Amino acid sequence: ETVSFKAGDVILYPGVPGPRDRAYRVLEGLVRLEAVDEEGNALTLRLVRPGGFFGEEALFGQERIYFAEAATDVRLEPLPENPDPELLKDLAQHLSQGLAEAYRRIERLATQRLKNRMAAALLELSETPLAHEEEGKVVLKATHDELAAAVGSVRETVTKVIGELAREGYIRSGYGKIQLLDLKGLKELAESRG
Amino acid sequence: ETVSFKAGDVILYPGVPGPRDRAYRVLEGLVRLEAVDEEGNALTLRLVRPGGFFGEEALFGQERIYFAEAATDVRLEPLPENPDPELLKDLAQHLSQGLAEAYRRIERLATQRLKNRMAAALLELSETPLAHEEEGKVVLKATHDELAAAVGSVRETVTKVIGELAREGYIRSGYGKIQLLDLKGLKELAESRG
Numbered sequence: 001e002t003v004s005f006k007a008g009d010v011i012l013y014p015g016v017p018g019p020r021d022r023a024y025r026v027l028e029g030l031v032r033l034e035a036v037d038e039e040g041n042a043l044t045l046r047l048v049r050p051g052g053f054f055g056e057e058a059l060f061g062q063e064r065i066y067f068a069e070a071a072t073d074v075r076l077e078p079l080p081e082n083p084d085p086e087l088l089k090d091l092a093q094h095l096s097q098g099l100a101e102a103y104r105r106i107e108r109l110a111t112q113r114l115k116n117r118m119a120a121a122l123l124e125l126s127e128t129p130l131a132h133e134e135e136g137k138v139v140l141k142a143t144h145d146e147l148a149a150a151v152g153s154v155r156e157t158v159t160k161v162i163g164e165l166a167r168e169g170y171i172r173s174g175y176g177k178i179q180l181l182d183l184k185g186l187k188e189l190a191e192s193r194g
Numbered sequence: 195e196t197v198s199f200k201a202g203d204v205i206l207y208p209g210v211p212g213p214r215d216r217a218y219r220v221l222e223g224l225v226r227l228e229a230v231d232e233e234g235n236a237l238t239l240r241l242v243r244p245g246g247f248f249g250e251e252a253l254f255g256q257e258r259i260y261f262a263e264a265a266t267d268v269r270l271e272p273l274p275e276n277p278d279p280e281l282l283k284d285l286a287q288h289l290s291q292g293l294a295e296a297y298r299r300i301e302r303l304a305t306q307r308l309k310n311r312m313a314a315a316l317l318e319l320s321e322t323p324l325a326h327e328e329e330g331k332v333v334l335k336a337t338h339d340e341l342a343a344a345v346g347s348v349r350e351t352v353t354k355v356i357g358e359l360a361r362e363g364y365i366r367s368g369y370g371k372i373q374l375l376d377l378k379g380l381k382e383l384a385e386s387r388g
Contacts, residue, residue, distance in 0.1 A: 035297065043300070056286070089282060099292050103332055107229055109300065110347075
């Protein structure tokens with residue numbers, strides 16, 4: 001069986017999973033897992049690309065501490081309540097990869113300057129359906145508030161970092177989009193603590 | 195089959211897993227997964243308690259970006275190269291829980307003050323074999339350098355935070371140990387952004 005969601009639609013809500021809640025495997029599109037505070041602002045916890053899994057806590061009775069939102073139009077595949085061996089192995093493989101990527105995020109938050117973390121965030125997003133190319137340059141669809149959620153910062157600080165990256169020539173910014181001009185330069189920032 | 199390691203022994207090294215590398219399930223003791231930089235200093239990525247799993251990347255040919263060290267004497271159970279369904283489900287359950295805990299760590303690093311994160315770190319460690327009780331108070335075996343690795347900070351900043359917590363009466367510190375005096379107070383700090 002398969003289920004579809006339009007960009008912006010809420011797929012899962014935080015809390016103790018309901019008895020018929022299901023985990024999902026992404027077939028197409030991008031899913032964003034995020035923590036939302038009492039003021040309605042978010043912190044992106046993980047991006048799930050095609051082939052990835054989320055909502056796994058429903059298989060184990062574990063509390064869901066995040067919202068699962070459709071970043072783009074998505075087509076999902078609900079997992080059975082009792083995944084067979086091969087599906088379970090694929091789930092485990094992806095949870096292992098996800099945990100390692102979370103480790104990398106922890107490393108960045110603990111040791112990397114915001115400007116450098118933003119460069120990494122921009123490159124990461126450039127590998128998703130939220131980006132494409134215009135005039136031969138990668139163009140990302142992302143507002144400053146979304147970028148703030150991506151690097152775990154606030155609008156003002158992000159706006160200042162984006163402005164500096166723009167003035168230096170790494171990117172161009174406007175109309176809810178970011179155009180990447182110097183990919184090699186951004187990669188160098190992303191790989192440095194700053 | 196079962197294997198044992200003494201406190202301080204390296205269980206796994208970072209890099210591409212060897213063809214006979216195995217994942218492990220902890221039977222007794224505490225295992226610490228940590229990232230180590232070029233200067234030999236660490237950032238703790240995850241603590242694995244009895245029943246937990248680590249080294250899972252060996253099951254999937256994924257690069258290991260951490261060292262697996264025996265925090266205390268440990269007894270481990272190597273997983274077969276092809277875990278049966280029930281073992282695989284337990285592994286997945288623990289990777290899911292581990293990922294959720296990583297999400298919480300990301301939230302703390304992005305929104306919580308160091309003093310408050312230290313309170314959380316102290317309480318977390320108090321639930322492991324690294325702690326016990328003396329004079330009716332929890333006493334944690336942890337040097338300032340280890341605490342720095344636990345909260346992703348540096349020795350100096352940790353020393354100052356520990357000194358303030360001590361002067362205020364939350365803890366007592368000395369001889370590589372931390373004595374928790376006000377558990378309720380520490381919990382309040384741990385649950386607040388600061």
